Ligand binder design. Structure first.
Ligand code: PP9
Ligand code: PP9
Lengths: 384, 384
């Protein structure tokens, strides 16, 4: 049921930017999203500092809204792109900034300060990673009720960083409109026609999130990272035509769930947790299945939970002529190897692989929240 | 302005599939669009008819809505993709079938029935056309309140035609959210921050549309074309970053209109018609400006009429590193030569070319309407 969904009709609804934590992690999913990675063009630590301050300014403004910055002298470029009209509605916009492995190289001398488990994403067996769609110094996750707002945000940012950022890759996604407008009641349905994110940790549970998502002082981590979160992002293609030609029974054996209800097979309700003990040969829920491999339920690596916050995407055609569509997968963890790396390892060889093809994304660390208007992104990181 | 807009929240809204004309032409603009071109895999006229009859039935079902076709034998593929859940809501869906020049080749014996002005699109001076994004035997223009309904319909059509259609190219589009909710009280804003649609002819105006948009009996066309319409589709990239860093005065000089109000420069209202004769030097509205070149409004310029129904698009990043965003331009006209072909010939060398780049699209003839449940696409074209 977590993190929930937020209604696309709330043009004046605001999400808090300032906080202990960044919005857009625990925040219920907005209808539209953009994942955009950048290469940082900062000369030195001081320039990186200038960028993060500037990002703070822009994010505070856009996420809360206000009248479009007008342009008193027409010899100058417009201060706003104008694609939203004369007023910049906040439209439930959240902007979540996160940093890549590559940012702690020799450029800004932040190597000693790198998060412990942060690393460059390397391939898993079913992957066909496209280098054009991988990594980046920073990633921005931009969510709002509407695609218009999201894009307006991207362009405000670009207009403000021409010598600080260069767009690396970018993908836009959505969640199924029904589940978006039902407001947390209903799970988003993916483009394979199955419900996505049923088994998520209660995101309203501020105490479980401290265990699952947030970095806490107890972990073998650099002090600045506290209140942040390891972010794993995977760009996943679906073989859609082929899928729709595949028996429903087979579709259900692959996921291990009923397609209409989202309940594990042989159980009644969507959120029913199975006992795999009773099904040693996986006659009901295959040992193959997506749900089953995703957790042996051994208790010791139930400690391996993660919050998932994915989005459908639909683009054009693939290089081979098939429909280019699937999943923008995003999950947040207190620990990257304990989270995503453990689970995907666990999932290698799953029957779903015949139908999905990971092609991009990477690992990033989502910074601590900006506490208020005198704080900024990486204020903790750049000090120390 | 015309043709108006429809709000994206209305899942139980219906557009009439059947009638004298196809919907998705005069219909006010829904918030989401897909243009998808197919190659035809039918080998003879018999199979073409089989396809045309089959698209009639699929389109009638999708556009009116209904419970998803249940799959009683799950050893078969699901009869529905399930990405909409149990109910296929109408969601203002319209699906408009058009046929390309190539359909009228030696395959189907249709060469003598070809629309007088139908031709393969060939480049204009500023084009950078991509083979992969051009032409097609048939084009579908699939519009609805939501992206979900549009994709669902595509996948339904694909599932049912594996021996008859192969996807050629596909782009998804959208119109600006604020204007989505105004229901026509606002013209859509394009991704350059300017209003797109202002001077469109009155789409509710019955008699005007008979002159401007529909093929009628007085024009020298094959009978089967009556009530159909010529359709030009241009896939157009915007150089968005360069634009956003261009002076407002020059942005406004290039269009010939005030960005904030949309009014022709030197006038106060959006729909004001400028009289160019009072400004022969073009000191108020530039001579190479989009409004002036397109629309001199002279003697021979009352026949160049077309109806524009364009959508914004945003994908990822071009090979060269720029945001891939632009316009899915579609227009309708009673005669392609007198409409689009004349108008673009006038636009050649306009100042806006620096900022836009046609890369795909095509010319197609949108069929006459399916009269009722006993009629089918192409009945009159396939008859004698
Ligand atoms: C390959 C394409 C993928 C699809 C179509 C997908 C979607 C799903 N993921 C699900 C559950 C899940 N998938 C999971 C691991 C992952 N799955 C991933 C990739 C995909 N994830 C990635 C990447 C994962 C992380 C490593 C986990 C951990 C669950 C939670 C279910 C459980 O048993 O706790 C479910 C079923 C509903 C639910 O939440 O139980 C769907 C439909
Ligand atoms: C090149 C990229 C294009 C952009 C940025 C564009 C956008 C616009 N097109 C406009 C009008 C128009 N554009 C028009 C022909 C075309 N326009 C085309 C492509 C574009 N059209 C193509 C291709 C055309 C076919 C020849 C016409 C005919 C009008 C209506 C004349 C007018 O008053 O602007 C207007 C002015 C307000 C309005 O909607 O009347 C904008 C902002």
């Amino acid at each position: 049921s977590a993190p929930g969904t937020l209604s696309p009709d709330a043009r004046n609804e605001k999400q808090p930017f300032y906080g202990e934590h960044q919005a857009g992690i625990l925040t219920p999913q907005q209808a539209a999203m953009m994942l955009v990675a950048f290469d940082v063009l900062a000369s030195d630590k001081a320039d990186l500092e200038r960028l993060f301050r500037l990002l703070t300014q822009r994010f505070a403004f856009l996420t809360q809204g206000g009248a479009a910055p007008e342009t008193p002298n027409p010899r100058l470029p417009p201060l706003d792109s104008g694609i939203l009209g004369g007023y910049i509605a906040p439209d439930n916009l959240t902007i979540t900034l996160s940093v890549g492995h590559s940012l702690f190289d020799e450029r800004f001398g932040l190597a000693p300060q790198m998060p412990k488990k942060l690393q460059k994403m390397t391939r898993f067996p079913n992957d066909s990673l496209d280098a054009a769609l991988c990594h980046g110094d920073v990633l921005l996750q931009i969510c709002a009720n509407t695609q218009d707002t999201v894009i307006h945000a991207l362009r405000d940012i670009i207009k403000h960083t021409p010598d600080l950022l260069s767009v690396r890759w970018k993908r836009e996604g959505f969640i199924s409109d029904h589940a978006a407008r039902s407001k947390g009641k209903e799970t988003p349905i993916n483009l394979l026609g199955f419900k996505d994110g049923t088994a998520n940790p209660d995101s309203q549970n501020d105490k479980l999130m401290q265990k699952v998502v947030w970095v806490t002082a107890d972990q073998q981590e650099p002090a600045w990272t506290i209140g942040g979160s390891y972010q794993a992002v995977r760009l996943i293609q679906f073989r859609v035509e082929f899928w729709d030609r595949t028996p429903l029974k087979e579709q259900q054996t692959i996921f291990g769930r009923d397609k209409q209800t989202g309940a594990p097979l042989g159980m009644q309700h969507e959120h029913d947790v199975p006992d795999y003990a009773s099904d040693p040969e996986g006659k009901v829920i295959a040992l193959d299945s997506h749900i089953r491999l995703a957790n042996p339920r051994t208790a010791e690596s139930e400690s391996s939970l993660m919050l998932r916050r994915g989005y459908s995407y639909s683009l054009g055609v693939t290089n081979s002529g098939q429909l280019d569509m699937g999943l923008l997968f995003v999950c947040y963890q207190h620990d990257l190897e304990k989270g995503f790396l453990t689970v995907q390892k666990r999932l290698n060889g799953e029957a779903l692989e015949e139908y999905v093809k990971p092609i991009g994304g990477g690992y990033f660390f989502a910074l601590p929240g900006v506490k208020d208007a005198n704080d900024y992104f990486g204020s903790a990181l750049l000090r120390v």
